[PDB]
Write a protein that binds this ligand. Structure first.
Ligand code: LI1
Ligand code: RET
Length: 210
């Protein structure tokens, strides 16, 4: 298990580093914003994984809290979403992570069930907006934006959807998957949803205003 935390810490660190060095010199106003957000995401995750190496897993949970909203912000800027829609998204994301925590805090099966069901519901509203709401908006924009958004959209829906699955069969849910393997799983997902995500976005010309 120490290997998963170490490997994760290194991958987040190197990603943050790459994104950080790549964005320097880049003078495009529009582009600089994507770099700021995208470098911050893996920087926050790196800090938490490094903390776990020195340390339970609620640390990684705290990182989801800060990062998921930023990843959503990245997507919203890509398709030039209006203020209202962004707020609703981050609001629902806040409920997703918040109720996920509340339920993992209640011992009675029935109460918890509802918290994690409410959490999943908020997650589905988010993915619905991204898939249906954001896609229509993206297709009315520059080809580069439409195309890069579609990939980031597909990566996000698949990866994000896997979290509740792992969690339910893991030590927090049914207790099927061992605590060490669960850690393996979440690190791969996290590295994918942030570094893999950032790589796709930042190596694309869609971030420039033109
Ligand atoms: C600048 C360098 C390159 C980075 C160097 C890293 C060295 C380690 C940092 C030292 C300090 C770390 C913060 C606390 C640690 C443990 C986290 O605690 C968990 C307990 O269930 C979660 O609580 C809730 C925790 C909340 C925290 C959310 C993340 C923030 C990111 C900053
Ligand atoms: C870098 C980290 C990312 C992208 C983390 C994403 C986490 C989620 C989408 C978590 C979702 C959950 C539910 C929908 C139900 C309750 C349990 C959670 C918190 C695992």
């Amino acid at each position: 298990e120490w290997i998963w935390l170490a490997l994760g810490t290194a991958l987040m660190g190197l990603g943050t580093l790459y994104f950080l060095v790549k964005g320097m010199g880049v003078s495009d106003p529009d582009a600089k914003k994507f770099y700021a957000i995208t470098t911050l995401v893996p920087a926050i995750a790196f800090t938490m994984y490094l903390s776990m190496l020195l340390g339970i897993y609620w640390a990684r949970y705290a990182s989801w809290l800060f990062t998921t909203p930023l990843l959503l912000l990245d997507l919203a800027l890509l398709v030039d979403a209006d203020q209202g829609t962004i707020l609703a998204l981050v609001g629902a994301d806040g409920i997703m992570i918040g109720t996920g925590l509340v339920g993992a805090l209640t011992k009675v099966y029935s109460y918890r069930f509802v918290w994690w069901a409410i959490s999943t519901a908020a997650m589905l509203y988010i993915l619905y907006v991204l898939f249906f709401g954001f896609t229509s908006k993206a297709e009315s924009m520059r080809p580069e934006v439409a195309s890069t958004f579609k990939v980031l959209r597909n990566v996000t829906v698949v990866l994000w959807s896997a979290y509740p699955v792992v969690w339910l069969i893991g030590s927090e849910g049914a207790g099927i998957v061992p605590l060490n393997i669960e850690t393996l799983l979440f690190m791969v997902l996290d590295v994918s949803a942030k570094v893999g995500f950032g790589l796709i976005l930042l190596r694309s010309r869609a971030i420039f205003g033109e």
